[PDB]
Amino acid sequence: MEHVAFGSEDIENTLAKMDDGQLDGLAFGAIQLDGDGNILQYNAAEGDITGQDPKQVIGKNFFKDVAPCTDSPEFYGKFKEGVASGNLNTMFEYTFDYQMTPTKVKVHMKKALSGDSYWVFVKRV
Numbered sequence: 307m308e309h310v311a312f313g314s315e316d317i318e319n320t321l322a323k324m325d326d327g328q329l330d331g332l333a334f335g336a337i338q339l340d341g342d343g344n345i346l347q348y349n350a351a352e353g354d355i356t357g358q359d360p361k362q363v364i365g366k367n368f369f370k371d372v373a374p375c376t377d378s379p380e381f382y383g384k385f386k387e388g389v390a391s392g393n394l395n396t397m398f399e400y401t402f403d404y405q406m407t408p409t410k411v412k413v414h415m416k417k418a419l420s421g422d423s424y425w426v427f428v429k430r431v
C-alpha cells in the first residue's frame with residue numbers, strides 16, 4: 307500500500323501508481339501541469355484550498371489565469387528551469403492571493419514519471 311505524504315522523497319513514484327480517487331484522497335493539494343503550465347489534473351484538496359471546483363480549472367493555464375501570483379522568478383521561473391533540465395524538485399513557501407484570501411502555503415514542485423508532466427504539491431502553513 308501507498309504511504310505518501312507531502313515531501314516524500316519518492317512521491318512521483320507513488321503517484322504514478324495511484325488513480326484519480328486516490329489523488330483526491332491525499333491530504334495535500336496536488337496539481338499536474340504540462341511543460342507549458344496547462345493544468346492536466348487538480349485534486350480535491352487543492353480545490354478546497356482555493357474554493358472552487360477542480361473541473362473548472364482543468365485545461366486552464368496555471369501561471370496565466372488560475373494562479374497569476376505564481377508568475378514570478380521564484381515559482382514560474384523555477385518551474386521552467388526544472389522542466390528544461392528534467393530535474394524539477396524544489397520546495398519553498400509562497401502566498402496564494404488571486405481571487406482568494408491571501409493564504410500562506412508550502413509548495414513542492416516535482417517532475418512526474420508520466421511524460422511532459424510536472425507536479426505542484428501544496429499544503430497549508
Ligand SMILES: *C(=O)/C=C/c1ccc(O)cc1
Pocket residue numbers: 352356372373374375376401402403404
Ligand atoms: C496566486 O495567484 C495563486 C493562486 C492559486 C494557487 C494555486 C491554486 O491551485 C489556485 C490559485
